[PDB]
């Protein structure tokens, strides 16, 4: 039950390159950065050059909740991604301020995820890692149609990031290390908190 996907085409569209840039920045500055850091901005999002492996599992009408203050459809997919996608950030370190440049890359997800096209727009909400225990047990309902869909227990989900690589470009190293550490932890949270159902990325 596979979904081929025109990555050539997709990796090209800027409406999408942007707007995930924007998604990130918006949610980023919603956090509290520590004192060694400033003007932390995603400068450049870049997809793989390889797509993910996409297995359709259910179609539905988008949940009510996507409807908010047909011709619409909502794919429950398995995403598997061990590809070459990279985020390019930029911050100021802290007598003086040193501008730094980072890359996040080597992002690994193997994931259940809702994809919902409606009224011109696309919503991407991750649900959980396939190897999440909560699946093995009938202890977390991932049928979005669907009583008690992601009821309690939802908060016990395992990280959706399976792995991730952040590299940057005196004893300021104490800070560029552990800067690198902060970002990971942040970025993980940014996904857990703002990209995983009940939350989602929004685009068009």
UniProtKB/Swiss-Prot annotation:
Q: Keywords in alphabetical order, please.
A: Endoplasmic reticulum, Lipid transport, Lipid-binding, Membrane, Mitochondrion, Mitochondrion outer membrane, Transport
* The SMP-LTD domain, residue ranges: 1-204
Cystine crosslinks = none
Q: What is known of its domains?
A: The SMP-LTD domain is a barrel-like domain that can bind various types of glycerophospholipids in its interior and mediate their transfer between two adjacent bilayers.
Q: Tell me the membrane topology, using the record's own terms.
A: Peripheral membrane protein
Q: What is a single molecular function from GO for this protein?
A: lipid binding
Q: Which organism is it from?
A: Kluyveromyces lactis (strain ATCC 8585 / CBS 2359 / DSM 70799 / NBRC 1267 / NRRL Y-1140 / WM37) (Yeast)
* Entry GO CC: endoplasmic reticulum membrane; ERMES complex
- Its protein name is Mitochondrial distribution and morphology protein 12
- Give the record's family classification: Belongs to the MDM12 family.
The job of this chain, per UniProt, is described as: Component of the ERMES/MDM complex, which serves as a molecular tether to connect the endoplasmic reticulum (ER) and mitochondria. Components of this complex are involved in the control of mitochondrial shape and protein biogenesis, and function in nonvesicular lipid trafficking between the ER and mitochondria. MDM12 is required for the interaction of the ER-resident membrane protein MMM1 and the outer mitochondrial membrane-resident beta-barrel protein MDM10.
Please verify whether the record's keywords include Ubl conjugation. Answer: no
Binding partners and assembly: Component of the ER-mitochondria encounter structure (ERMES) or MDM complex, composed of MMM1, MDM10, MDM12 and MDM34. A MMM1 homodimer associates with one molecule of MDM12 on each side in a pairwise head-to-tail manner, and the SMP-LTD domains of MMM1 and MDM12 generate a continuous hydrophobic tunnel for phospholipid trafficking.
Q: Which residues of the full protein are shown?
A: 1 to 234 of 305
Location within or outside the cell: Mitochondrion outer membrane; Endoplasmic reticulum membrane
Q: Which domain of life is it from?
A: Eukaryota
Q: Which GO terms describe its biological process?
A: mitochondrial genome maintenance; mitochondrion-endoplasmic reticulum membrane tethering; phospholipid transport; protein insertion into mitochondrial outer membrane
Gene it is expressed from: MDM12
């Amino acid at each position: 039950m596979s979904v081929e996907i025109d990555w050539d085409n997709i990796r090209g569209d800027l409406s999408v390159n942007q707007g995930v840039k924007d998604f990130l920045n918006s949610r980023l500055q919603e956090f509290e950065l520590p004192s060694y850091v400033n003007n932390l901005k995603v400068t450049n999002f870049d997809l793989g050059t390889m797509p993910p492996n996409v297995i359709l599992k259910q179609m539905d009408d988008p949940l009510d909740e996507f409807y908010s203050y047909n011709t619409d459809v909502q794919l429950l997919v398995e995403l598997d991604y061990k590809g070459d996608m990279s985020i390019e950030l930029s911050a100021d370190l802290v007598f003086m301020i040193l501008p730094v440049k980072l890359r996040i890359s080597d992002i690994g997800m193997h994931c259940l995820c809702l994809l919902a096209y409606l009224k011109k727009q696309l919503f991407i909400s991750f649900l959980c890692d396939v190897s999440d225990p909560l699946l093995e047990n009938d202890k977390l309902q991932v049928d979005p149609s669907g009583p008690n869909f992601m009821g309690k227990r939802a908060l016990e989900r395992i990280s959706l990031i399976r792995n991730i690589k952040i590299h940057t470009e005196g004893s300021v190293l104490r800070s560029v290390g552990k800067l690198e550490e902060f970002l990971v932890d942040l970025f993980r949270n940014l996904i857990r908190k703002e990209a995983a159902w009940p939350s989602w990325i929004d685009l068009d």
